Design a protein around this ligand. Structure first.
Ligand code: NI
Ligand code: NI
Ligand code: NI
Lengths: 117, 18
Protein backbone atom coordinates (compact mmCIF):
# COMPACT_ATOMS: atom_id res chain seq x y z
CA UNK A 1 0.00 0.00 0.00
CA UNK A 2 1.27 3.41 -1.09
CA UNK A 3 1.26 6.47 1.17
CA UNK A 4 1.77 9.94 -0.27
CA UNK A 5 3.57 10.88 2.96
CA UNK A 6 6.31 8.35 2.16
CA UNK A 7 6.64 9.60 -1.42
CA UNK A 8 6.94 13.24 -0.30
CA UNK A 9 9.38 12.82 2.62
CA UNK A 10 12.45 10.59 2.28
CA UNK A 11 13.07 7.70 4.62
CA UNK A 12 16.07 9.09 6.55
CA UNK A 13 14.19 12.29 7.43
CA UNK A 14 11.06 10.37 8.44
CA UNK A 15 13.15 8.00 10.54
CA UNK A 16 14.98 10.76 12.35
CA UNK A 17 11.65 12.50 13.12
CA UNK A 18 10.21 9.21 14.39
CA UNK A 19 13.11 8.76 16.81
CA UNK A 20 12.64 12.28 18.20
CA UNK A 21 8.85 11.83 18.59
CA UNK A 22 9.04 8.42 20.28
CA UNK A 23 11.45 10.01 22.79
CA UNK A 24 9.40 13.20 23.30
CA UNK A 25 6.08 11.32 23.70
CA UNK A 26 6.90 7.77 24.83
CA UNK A 27 3.36 7.28 26.17
CA UNK A 28 1.90 8.07 22.71
CA UNK A 29 2.08 6.25 19.37
CA UNK A 30 2.69 8.32 16.17
CA UNK A 31 0.15 7.56 13.43
CA UNK A 32 0.19 8.70 9.80
CA UNK A 33 -3.41 8.56 8.53
CA UNK A 34 -4.21 8.82 4.81
CA UNK A 35 -7.20 8.33 2.55
CA UNK A 36 -6.98 5.09 0.61
CA UNK A 37 -6.60 5.29 -3.19
CA UNK A 38 -9.92 5.47 -5.09
CA UNK A 39 -11.81 6.15 -1.86
CA UNK A 40 -14.94 8.33 -2.12
CA UNK A 41 -14.95 10.02 1.26
CA UNK A 42 -13.98 13.22 3.01
CA UNK A 43 -10.46 14.43 2.84
CA UNK A 44 -8.37 14.63 6.03
CA UNK A 45 -6.81 17.99 6.70
CA UNK A 46 -3.86 16.63 8.72
CA UNK A 47 -1.97 13.38 8.52
CA UNK A 48 0.05 13.20 11.76
CA UNK A 49 -1.49 12.05 15.03
CA UNK A 50 -0.14 11.35 18.51
CA UNK A 51 -2.52 9.02 20.34
CA UNK A 52 -2.37 7.19 23.70
CA UNK A 53 -1.13 3.62 23.35
CA UNK A 54 -4.15 2.28 25.25
CA UNK A 55 -6.64 3.95 22.92
CA UNK A 56 -8.63 1.29 21.11
CA UNK A 57 -9.02 1.10 17.35
CA UNK A 58 -12.76 1.56 17.89
CA UNK A 59 -12.04 4.80 19.73
CA UNK A 60 -9.70 5.89 16.93
CA UNK A 61 -12.56 5.22 14.51
CA UNK A 62 -14.62 7.75 16.48
CA UNK A 63 -11.86 10.39 16.40
CA UNK A 64 -11.29 10.13 12.64
CA UNK A 65 -15.02 9.90 11.79
CA UNK A 66 -15.62 13.24 13.56
CA UNK A 67 -12.73 14.98 11.77
CA UNK A 68 -14.04 13.93 8.37
CA UNK A 69 -17.63 14.78 9.48
CA UNK A 70 -19.21 11.42 8.74
CA UNK A 71 -22.66 10.58 9.98
CA UNK A 72 -22.71 7.28 11.85
CA UNK A 73 -24.86 6.11 8.92
CA UNK A 74 -21.68 6.33 6.81
CA UNK A 75 -19.02 3.62 6.92
CA UNK A 76 -15.31 3.93 7.74
CA UNK A 77 -12.68 1.19 7.45
CA UNK A 78 -9.07 1.28 8.59
CA UNK A 79 -6.33 -0.70 6.87
CA UNK A 80 -2.87 -1.56 8.14
CA UNK A 81 -0.72 -3.60 5.76
CA UNK A 82 -3.82 -4.13 3.57
CA UNK A 83 -5.68 -5.67 6.54
CA UNK A 84 -8.53 -4.29 8.66
CA UNK A 85 -7.25 -4.23 12.25
CA UNK A 86 -9.44 -5.62 15.05
CA UNK A 87 -11.71 -2.95 16.52
CA UNK A 88 -10.84 -4.03 20.08
CA UNK A 89 -7.06 -3.87 19.58
CA UNK A 90 -5.18 -0.94 21.07
CA UNK A 91 -3.05 1.49 19.10
CA UNK A 92 -0.10 0.32 21.20
CA UNK A 93 -0.63 -3.27 20.05
CA UNK A 94 -0.95 -2.13 16.43
CA UNK A 95 2.22 -0.06 16.78
CA UNK A 96 4.28 -2.95 18.18
CA UNK A 97 3.26 -5.42 15.46
CA UNK A 98 3.04 -3.01 12.53
CA UNK A 99 5.17 0.08 13.07
CA UNK A 100 7.38 0.71 10.11
CA UNK A 101 11.08 1.20 10.14
CA UNK A 102 10.64 4.98 10.46
CA UNK A 103 8.93 4.35 13.86
CA UNK A 104 5.54 5.42 12.46
CA UNK A 105 2.32 3.43 12.25
CA UNK A 106 0.63 3.81 8.86
CA UNK A 107 -3.16 3.55 8.66
CA UNK A 108 -5.20 4.06 5.51
CA UNK A 109 -8.91 4.79 5.70
CA UNK A 110 -11.71 4.26 3.21
CA UNK A 111 -15.46 4.01 2.74
CA UNK A 112 -14.98 0.59 1.11
CA UNK A 113 -14.12 -2.61 2.99
CA UNK A 114 -11.28 -3.63 0.64
CA UNK A 115 -8.18 -1.46 0.30
CA UNK A 116 -7.87 0.11 -3.14
CA UNK A 117 -11.40 -0.70 -4.35
CA UNK B 1 4.19 19.44 9.69
CA UNK B 2 3.11 19.59 13.31
CA UNK B 3 1.40 16.64 15.06
CA UNK B 4 -2.19 16.60 16.32
CA UNK B 5 -1.93 15.67 20.01
CA UNK B 6 -5.55 14.70 20.65
CA UNK B 7 -6.67 16.26 23.96
CA UNK B 8 -7.66 14.33 27.06
CA UNK B 9 -11.33 15.37 26.67
CA UNK B 10 -11.61 14.36 23.01
CA UNK B 11 -10.07 11.07 24.17
CA UNK B 12 -12.72 10.93 26.92
CA UNK B 13 -15.49 11.67 24.44
CA UNK B 14 -14.21 8.77 22.32
CA UNK B 15 -14.12 6.43 25.34
CA UNK B 16 -17.81 7.37 26.02
CA UNK B 17 -19.13 6.88 22.57
CA UNK B 18 -17.65 3.37 22.38
NI1 NI C 1 9.56 16.11 5.54
NI1 NI D 1 -1.72 -8.06 13.40
NI1 NI E 1 11.11 -1.96 14.18
Amino acid sequence: MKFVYKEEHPFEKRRSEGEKIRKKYPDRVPVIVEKAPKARIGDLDKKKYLVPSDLTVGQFYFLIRKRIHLRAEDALFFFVNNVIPPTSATMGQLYQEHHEEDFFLYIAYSDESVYGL
Amino acid sequence: EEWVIVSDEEIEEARQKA
